Amino acid sequence: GPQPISRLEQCGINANDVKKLEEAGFHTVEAVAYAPKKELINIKGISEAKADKILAEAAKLVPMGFTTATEFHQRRSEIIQITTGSKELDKLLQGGIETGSITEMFGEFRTGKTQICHTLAVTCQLPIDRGGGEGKAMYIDTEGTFRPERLLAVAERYGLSGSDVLDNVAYARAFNTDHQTQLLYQASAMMVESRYALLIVDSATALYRTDYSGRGELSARQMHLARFLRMLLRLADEFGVAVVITNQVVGNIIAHASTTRLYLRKGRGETRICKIYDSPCLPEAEAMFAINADGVGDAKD
Amino acid sequence: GPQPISRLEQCGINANDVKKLEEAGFHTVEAVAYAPKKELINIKGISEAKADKILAEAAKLVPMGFTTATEFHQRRSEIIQITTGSKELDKLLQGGIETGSITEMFGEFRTGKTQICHTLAVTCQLPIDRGGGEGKAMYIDTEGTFRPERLLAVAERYGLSGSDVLDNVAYARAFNTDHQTQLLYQASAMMVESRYALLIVDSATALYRTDYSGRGELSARQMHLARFLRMLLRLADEFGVAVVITNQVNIIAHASTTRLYLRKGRGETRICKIYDSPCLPEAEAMFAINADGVGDAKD
Amino acid sequence: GPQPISRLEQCGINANDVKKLEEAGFHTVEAVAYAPKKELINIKGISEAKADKILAEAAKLVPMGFTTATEFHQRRSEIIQITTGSKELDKLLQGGIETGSITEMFGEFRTGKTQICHTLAVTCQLPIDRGGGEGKAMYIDTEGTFRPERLLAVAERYGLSGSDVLDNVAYARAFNTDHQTQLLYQASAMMVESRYALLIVDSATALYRTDYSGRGELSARQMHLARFLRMLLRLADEFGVAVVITNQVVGGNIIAHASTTRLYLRKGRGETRICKIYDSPCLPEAEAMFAINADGVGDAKD
Ligand SMILES: Nc1ncnc2c1ncn2[C@@H]1O[C@H](COP(=O)(O)OP(=O)(O)OP(=O)(O)O)[C@@H](O)[C@H]1O
Ligand SMILES: Nc1ncnc2c1ncn2[C@@H]1O[C@H](COP(=O)(O)OP(=O)(O)OP(=O)(O)O)[C@@H](O)[C@H]1O
Ligand SMILES: Nc1ncnc2c1ncn2[C@@H]1O[C@H](COP(=O)(O)OP(=O)(O)OP(=O)(O)O)[C@@H](O)[C@H]1O
Ligand SMILES: [Mg+2]
Ligand SMILES: [Mg+2]
Ligand SMILES: [Mg+2]
Structure with a gap:
């Protein structure tokens, strides 16, 4: 309602x-x-x-x-927790991704921030009894790293029709910061006629570094970024959907905007280690996972 | 009286x-x-x-x-000091949070401003002889970081009924500055029928940054914040309840009576420091954030 | 369209x-x-x-x-994948070099960065049904290692007229970074009148180390390189051509999101070489072995 x-x-x-x-x-x-x-x-x-x-x-x-x-x-008992594909990673989140709030994933390059997003873009269409959200997915890309074939591999894992999954995923690439915020206006109208469950912005900070490169224009990009983050929190409270954003680290505005922060770093081989940074309910703990052809899975040394 | x-x-x-x-x-x-x-x-x-x-x-x-x-x-001897859950932190406050005055906690993100509020939201229901205030709790949230499960863990620590603790905590999320101030009107009427002991506003400055973002509107938001702070001081003098507000880092200079600075230590340990206070000396104290709430550090 | x-x-x-x-x-x-x-x-x-x-x-x-x-x-299904000459290497790329995106090949010296470019400079003229792009080639050289005789040997392998292959390959040597970026303006105008399919820059990072050698000028060369990399990505989205650049690693953090597929090259026994994929959104971390024959880049034959 x-x-x-x-x-x-x-x-x-x-x-x-x-x-x-x-x-x-x-x-x-x-x-x-x-x-x-x-x-x-x-x-x-x-x-x-x-x-x-x-x-x-x-x-x-x-x-x-x-x-x-x-x-x-009791309102938190009605919150849907979307599975991440890894059982050890789901235990770290006390169930999964909390809907109605913003989740930030900051980590080095090639760690797997984009890979986690593609996995969640399919698991949200799963039945609620299997850890899904029974809603469409929305992917806002800024790096050009969106691959629909990666979505098909995740659908085959959980036995979903790959054609139906691609029909329930909205994709659009933002060319600049002004275009990045403008896409949220169309996003609000689309979520009214059909039910969505996940909003992905990868990456939410890449376009803010190439456009405003000067020193006097630093305050300008902070005004535009703060306004962009406020619309994400409004959409989360409006539709009760999960908001996942990525950030590249080699940033004080995404402090209060994100409700749960995740740090990603590379382990030995294809294994990855995840740690929770800021969270109001989750304790500081770590969990290990891997990146397989089926998406984000559990570590298998 | x-x-x-x-x-x-x-x-x-x-x-x-x-x-x-x-x-x-x-x-x-x-x-x-x-x-x-x-x-x-x-x-x-x-x-x-x-x-x-x-x-x-x-x-x-x-x-x-x-x-x-x-x-x-002798009138100050009747002021109730609510415990914070950490013995080293209670000594820093010369007893605890003073009721009838505004207490500001300013610090960086992830320091633990919200954690102290959730801990105080349960310890205030304890008997006064046990370090409590014998009153209900009121939580005004603006970040969406309110977690009732954190209140249950603190209640189990002090041996309180988790169901009764949640029944004595009033919660409401402010969507904007006008809504944030409007909630105080309902707050005053609720404190008349039942006895309350703590009012929490987390955060008291977050909505004043999201709404008023322009530069020509800077003088407008200062008038609205000053009016909001005066209503908090009026509620404190009227009902004798404790007012705790959080701030993420000049108008709250004389409005706030006790300022607390929070910074992170190694691991889950946190360090607390007193900034401005008329009675408390400039000192520091160490505490931790455990599953049972705010406890003492145990290396 | x-x-x-x-x-x-x-x-x-x-x-x-x-x-x-x-x-x-x-x-x-x-x-x-x-x-x-x-x-x-x-x-x-x-x-x-x-x-x-x-x-x-x-x-x-x-x-x-x-x-x-x-x-x-379906937009990615219309992307043309140019063959590299080695069947095992084409399988590693799930088809070949992706057009409309930047592909980086970083490796030690003598690994074969220049040899792969010369092979791709000829395979791009092949019909699309044969794994080509049906377009001309453009080679921007910075090392002086461009050899047209290597192009003739690859043309004989695929049965193409050596004279027609050399007529469809544009060559120009960049003497400095300012000249390296200036060549892209001429490249854009040439791709409008005639159809091109491949742009090669070998090497894309050599001139940025010899020209800007001081320490106070480090921030200056990063601004010039970042502007150069953005023009390459813009040309890829504009003309839908494949962009291949080489880099010597004795790479840079600016070519992180700019490049879509990174390839690591290392030497094997004899003339055999080993290729590995580094960063990619669709390709998995795997390795493949290939060789450098007189006919160009071919498969390993122990
Ligand atoms: N098809 C696949 N099968 C298995 N693993 C893959 C596949 N594709 C990519 N990977 C793995 O996933 C990783 C991709 O990292 P990713 O692109 O998510 O980094 P990122 O966080 O997006 O960095 P940035 O966005 O800053 O470029 C690679 O290291 C690779 O090992
Ligand atoms: N169940 C738990 N057990 C132990 N520690 C916890 C638990 N839940 C949270 N914590 C710790 O408490 C901290 C919570 O920080 P908190 O949300 O209070 O920051 P904050 O002051 O609200 O910052 P901001 O409000 O600006 O985001 C986390 O750093 C986490 O390590
Ligand atoms: N006609 C030929 N027949 C067979 N193999 C050849 C022939 N010409 C060159 N090669 C092989 O190809 C290799 C050429 O290496 P190449 O010049 O591509 O290195 P590179 O990656 O350009 O290094 P850099 O450009 O950084 O100096 C040589 O090691 C040589 O063995
Ligand atoms: Mg990515
Ligand atoms: Mg908080
Ligand atoms: Mg070379």
Whole structure:
């Protein structure tokens, strides 16, 4: 129950004003309730009086009162944890990737940040009883490393139709930072008509280094990156989907944006070691995994 | 003895005018005595004549004369200090978190600002004789980092019923600065029916960076934050509860009474340092983050 | 279908402004859509208003919306894979050299970086049904190791006219880094009038060590190399040709994401050589052995 924006018109908001909200980026009742007063006023063709009518009726459908901690604890029992393909890696995450939050994977090059994303892009279509999310996947690529054939190998592992998996994965390559943020506007509208479960941005920081290379323009890219991260957190709270982003390390804005940070480093041979950095519920522990032809699997020395 | 506002009606003020004061945020005689003349005039449906009647009769129940330092010293002896879970950390605070004042914890990410809040959200329910506050907990979250499972582990450490602990913790996530301030209005009404002891805002500065990002709007966000901090100080003086806020790293200079700096040590160990304080000396203390909550370091 | 830049003039942009885009390096509508806002504004005689009209109308011809994974799978199915001459080496690359992307071959001296380039310079002229690209070859040399006689021996192996093979190979030796980058401007104009299929730069890192030898100039050569690498990746997306560069490792961290497939070469017994794949999004870490024969790069024959 994400409260479609069409129900906001039933409260009293005229249908023409709803069109302005959809083109602005708001497609749910929870989105306008998330927005302050200044967000609706800045929209073209919306006065302060019209903004107050939206916030009042939006709070009726989505209440924001105080709830008991035992109630929010039961809300965590309804959270879906997507498997990563490795049993030892799933134990490290106390179940898997938590939906509705941003997960950051920072590590050296060639470690396997992109490989983990391709594996998760298929496991989200798995049934919920098998550790999936029963939703479509969304892959935003910036390195040119997207390979649909790698998705077919993961589908064969769990016995899913490779053709149906590719039909449920949306792909788009961002050419620049302005294009990278612009793709999120189309992403919000697509998640309203169909159910998605995973949003992948690989890489989320590559385009911010090539465009703004000067020293006086450092504050400019930080303003653009902060605005890009805020839209990711809004989409996570809006649709309850898992957000996975990659970062290349040879960065203080992705501190509070990410809810769970993962550090990847290379081990002996094809084995890799993963460690949890920042997390509110998971303890600092490590787990070993490997990168096989079937995707991300368990280590087999 | 904070003089509830119901006694103000007994002096001569009609009860209907008192209802307008409660909807504004004033629920005690000390609260309306705290407010100047301009605060009551700005309230809808209150004239200057009605405001003068309130302040005059409020001074009878709450006098504003000079008192001996030994008398105010005994009033500070009644202040409750909530334990933090670490014995070395409790010694640093000369007892623990002081109720009725704002405590700010500023530090880098992953230091443990949220972990201290979850630990204090359970230790505040302990009996006062056991180092608690004998009151419910209130958690206002802005990062999405609230974990009820962390509260259960701390409750099992001190031998408390996990179900009863979750029933005594109020949780609400603020989506923006306007929503963050709006939650305090509901918070004041909840503290009237039941006794609370701790108010947590994590983070108190995160939403003020996401909403107001421009440069021409810099003066606007400072006015909204200053008004938010004054409401926290008003709630602390009104109900005598502890206010704990986190900040990720000038307006919170005089607003905050005790500042705590957190930095990471080797492994799971953490180091805490006191920044600004009128009674606590500049000292440091070491603590750890265990599965049972915030405990002492054990090399 | 890369949408040539001449179609951008049909939308409303005057043809004279399009001429400035060709002199800058943009020859398709997908190229100006690839470029951000700052790239077009920095060009002499182009204002922000003219740049906004280009980017807006370019998005109309080349949409930048989300596509199904099955659609991008068919886009990779249309990519031409040029054979390397060794059957075991072609199996290692899941087909051959991928066009439209940069392929790096880093290895010690005498391993065979130059020999592989000469072999690919002839196999690209083969028919696509025979594993070729049906396009001309372009060789940018920096070591003075270009030998047309090696091209004639490879042409005799595949039964091609040696005279016609030499007529379809463009050669130019870069004397310095500034000359190395300047040759790419001439390369873009040549690929518009005639069809090319392969661009070879051997070596792509030799001139950046001899020219910039000081320590205070280290940050200067990295800016020039990074700008040079971006132009190679842009030409690959623009013309859909394969880009092969060689590097001596006694590599750089800037060619990390720029290169799509890295190959490591080491010497075996005799004339045999061993090849290994380093970084790749689709190819697994595996090794393959090959040899250097008089006919070019062939399979190992103990
Ligand atoms: N088909 C495959 N089968 C098995 N293993 C593979 C396959 N393809 C790639 N790998 C392995 O996965 C790794 C790929 O690393 P990856 O491309 O994910 O790095 P990355 O984190 O994306 O770095 P960057 O994005 O900065 O280039 C390689 O080291 C390789 O060993
Ligand atoms: N179950 C657990 N057992 C032991 N330690 C834990 C457990 N869960 C979390 N931790 C530790 O507590 C820390 C949590 O950091 P925390 O989330 O408090 O940072 P923070 O102050 O909220 O930073 P920010 O709010 O700016 O993101 C982690 O570094 C982790 O090592
Ligand atoms: N006509 C030929 N017949 C057989 N083998 C040959 C012939 N010509 C050259 N070779 C072999 O090919 C190899 C050439 O190595 P090559 O010049 O490709 O090294 P490289 O990778 O260019 O090193 P660098 O360019 O860094 O000096 C020689 O070792 C030689 O044995
Ligand atoms: Mg990658
Ligand atoms: Mg936190
Ligand atoms: Mg060579």
